[PDB]
């Protein structure tokens, strides 16, 4: 069907079987064909988004007589072994449930409920709904950033945190082999659902994502990661129009999962100039995309919260990073994790530059850390950063005049900053233990390091040579603590540090 005014009604279907699916930017299944854009309209007569032949187990949640509003949960469909699909009343629909399907098996075109609206109108409800991708799904309230998206990656969670509902950028493309943060984020972030727009896809980078993603295991469950993932593919052969539409299709599907009460992570990939469809107005529209991120009290009769957190890849034409697409993206995002080729070459992993990255969410999430994890989280983070800033200043100077004239105190700062970089920032994504670092382990590791700092400065303030501190036996254990899964063992290193230093205080006197 046609449509008057701007918008040829570009829409997406939302309901069972979104998970495990692979689509183009216009929600047609894997390896499907061509459409074209404009300030107006677009075409398409090809393939269906959700299979109409699949039988789903529907469990009714509401009953005849219940009053309902848009967003209310009227049933449950176990969609994969990981995710229960929540069947919701579409937005704009409210009234009395006059008819609802018994528990059993149904295809998505079967009417599973009917609602009588205030005026008497009878509306038929199915397991899916449709929504225009260019219209933000509505919600009751957008909440201020408050709760961290816990990534389990120390540098991110500690120094450059993402809020649930927040917006982050990282240098792209995702399919890049020089780093693995992009993948760590997808599997470890405490979002239940991942919407992934593999869009830096060109050459073998397409078929890389095709044959490996059904094999990737969700480490939280042992089950396949695809079972909580919707994949959306932008290839170089695809119509530039479907590739422009791709992120709206993505974000709309994400919003749909947040509406159920899930936290969702939208990961957007990019090669150079991912668009050509539709002045500075472009910058203003990318802005509108990012503004659709958020944690919200959702529609429904029950108080209910879900979120979409956005992580966008940023890869500029020349890779100098003063190009428009990077200026525009970095203007609206609240977090930037600066992947740094020089860090990577030195095999400092993850290769996140801790001087040029930033998060504007630190104060927003500090209270959740303080109340749930550690009362000193923010103070500790600021202290370790101050150490890292100092380190950088000292290295600059030492590049000019050399290290021979350094006082013990400055060498001590370099010693402890080095321990910070090696024992805390660096993290081993390939290790069965250090691949994820629980909040509780992060703070305890930090306490160990900062206590080591306090004791180093105190000890040199008492004329203990630094050389004696650099070789304190506990240092080796502090270096290995990221590999320890038992946090109480890590914690014990504080007392162990204290007494070793005591043996040092006695071996020197006064």
UniProtKB/Swiss-Prot annotation:
One MF term in the entry's GO annotations: endonuclease activity
Annotated GO CC locations: plasma membrane
Keyword tags: ATP synthesis, ATP-binding, Autocatalytic cleavage, Cell membrane, Endonuclease, Hydrogen ion transport, Hydrolase, Intron homing, Ion transport, Membrane, Nuclease, Nucleotide-binding, Protein splicing, Translocase, Transport
Topology in the lipid bilayer: Peripheral membrane protein
The protein's Enzyme Commission number: 7.1.2.2, 3.1.-.-
Compartments reported by the entry: Cell membrane
InterPro entries: ATP-synt_VA_C (IPR055190), ATP-synth_a_Xtn (IPR031686), ATP_synth_asu-like_sf (IPR023366), ATPase_a/bsu_AS (IPR020003), ATPase_F1/V1/A1_a/bsu_N (IPR004100), ATPase_F1/V1/A1_a/bsu_N_sf (IPR036121), ATPase_F1/V1/A1_a/bsu_nucl-bd (IPR000194), ATPase_F1/V1_b/a_C (IPR024034)
GO annotation terms (biological process): intein-mediated protein splicing; intron homing; proton motive force-driven plasma membrane ATP synthesis
Record PTM text: This protein undergoes a protein self splicing that involves a post-translational excision of the VDE intervening region (intein) followed by peptide ligation.
Catalytic activity: ATP + H2O + 4 H(+)(in) = ADP + phosphate + 5 H(+)(out)
Stretch forming the signal peptide: none
CDD domains to which the protein is assigned, alphabetical: ATP-synt_V_A-type_alpha_C (cd18111), ATP-synt_V_A-type_alpha_N (cd18119), Hint (cd00081), V_A-ATPase_A (cd01134)
Family annotation (Gene3D superfamilies): 2.40.30.20, 2.40.50.100, Bovine Mitochondrial F1-atpase, Atp Synthase Beta Chain, Chain D, domain 3, Hedgehog/Intein (Hint) domain, Homing endonucleases, P-loop containing nucleotide triphosphate hydrolases
Known role: Component of the A-type ATP synthase that produces ATP from ADP in the presence of a proton gradient across the membrane. The A chain is the catalytic subunit.
HAMAP family, alphabetized: ATP_synth_A_arch (MF_00309)
Alphabetical list of NCBIfam families matching this protein: intein_Cterm, intein_Nterm, PRK04192.1
Quaternary structure and interacting proteins, as annotated: Has multiple subunits with at least A(3), B(3), C, D, E, F, H, I and proteolipid K(x).
Assigned protein family: Belongs to the ATPase alpha/beta chains family.
Note: The intein interrupts the ATP-binding site.
UniProt-recorded name of the protein: A-type ATP synthase subunit A
Gene for this chain: atpA
């Amino acid at each position: 069907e046609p449509v008057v005014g701007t918008g040829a009604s570009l829409s997406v279907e939302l309901g069972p079987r979104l998970l495990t699916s692979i689509y183009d930017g216009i929600q047609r299944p894997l390896e499907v064909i061509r459409e074209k854009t404009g300030d107006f309209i677009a075409r398409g007569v090809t393939a269906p988004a959700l299979p109409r032949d699949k039988k789903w187990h529907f469990i009714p949640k509401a009953k005849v007589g219940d009053k309902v509003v848009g967003g209310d949960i009227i049933g449950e469909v176990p969609e994969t072994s990981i995710i229960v699909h929540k069947i919701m009343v579409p937005p704009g629909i409210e009234g009395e449930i006059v008819e609802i399907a018994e528990e059993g098996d149904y295809t998505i075109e079967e009417v599973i409920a009917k609602v009588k609206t205030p005026s008497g109108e009878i509306k038929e409800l199915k397991m899916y709904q449709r929504w225009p991708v260019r219209v933000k799904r509505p919600y009751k309230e957008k909440l201020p950033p408050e709760v961290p998206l816990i990534t389990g990656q120390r540098v991110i969670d500690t120094f450059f945190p993402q809020a649930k509902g927040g917006t982050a950028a990282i240098p792209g493309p995702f399919g890049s082999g020089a780093t693995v943060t992009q993948h760590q984020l997808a599997k470890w972030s405490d979002a239940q659902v991942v919407i992934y727009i593999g869009c830096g896809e060109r050459g073998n980078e397409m078929t890389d994502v095709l044959e490996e993603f059904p094999k990737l295991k969700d480490p939280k469950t042992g089950k396949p990661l695809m079972e909580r993932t919707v994949l959306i593919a932008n290839t170089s052969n695809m119509p530039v129009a479907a590739r422009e539409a791709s992120i709206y299709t993505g974000i709309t599907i994400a919003e749909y999962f947040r509406d159920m009460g899930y936290d969702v992570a939208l990961m957007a990939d990019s090669t150079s100039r991912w668009a050509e469809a539709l002045p500075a107005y472009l910058a203003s529209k990318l802005a509108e995309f990012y503004e659709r991120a958020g944690r919200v009290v959702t529609l429904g009769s029950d108080y209910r919260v879900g979120s979409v957190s956005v992580i966008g890849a940023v890869s500029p034409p020349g890779g100098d990073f003063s190009e428009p697409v990077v200026q525009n993206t970095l203007r609206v995002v609240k977090v930037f994790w600066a992947l740094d080729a020089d860090l990577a070459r030195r095999r400092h992993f993850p290769a996140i530059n801790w001087l040029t990255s930033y998060s504007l969410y630190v104060d927003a999430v500090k209270d959740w850390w303080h109340k749930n994890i550690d009362p000193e989280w923010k103070a500790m983070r600021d202290k370790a950063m101050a150490l890292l800033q100092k380190e950088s200043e000292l290295q600059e100077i030492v590049r000019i005049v050399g290290p021979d004239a350094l006082p013990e105190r400055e060498r001590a700062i370099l010693l402890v900053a080095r321990m910070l970089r090696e024992d805390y920032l660096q993290q081993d994504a390939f290790d069965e233990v250090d691949t994820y670092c629980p909040p509780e382990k992060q703070v305890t590791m930090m306490r160990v390091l900062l206590n080591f700092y306090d004791k180093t400065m105190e000890a040199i303030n008492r004329g203990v040579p630094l050389e004696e501190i650099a070789k304190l036996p506990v240092r080796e254990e502090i270096g290995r603590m990221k590999f320890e899964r038992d946090v109480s063992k890590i914690r014990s290193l504080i007392d162990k540090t204290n007494e070793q230093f005591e043996e040092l205080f006695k071996k020197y006197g006064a």
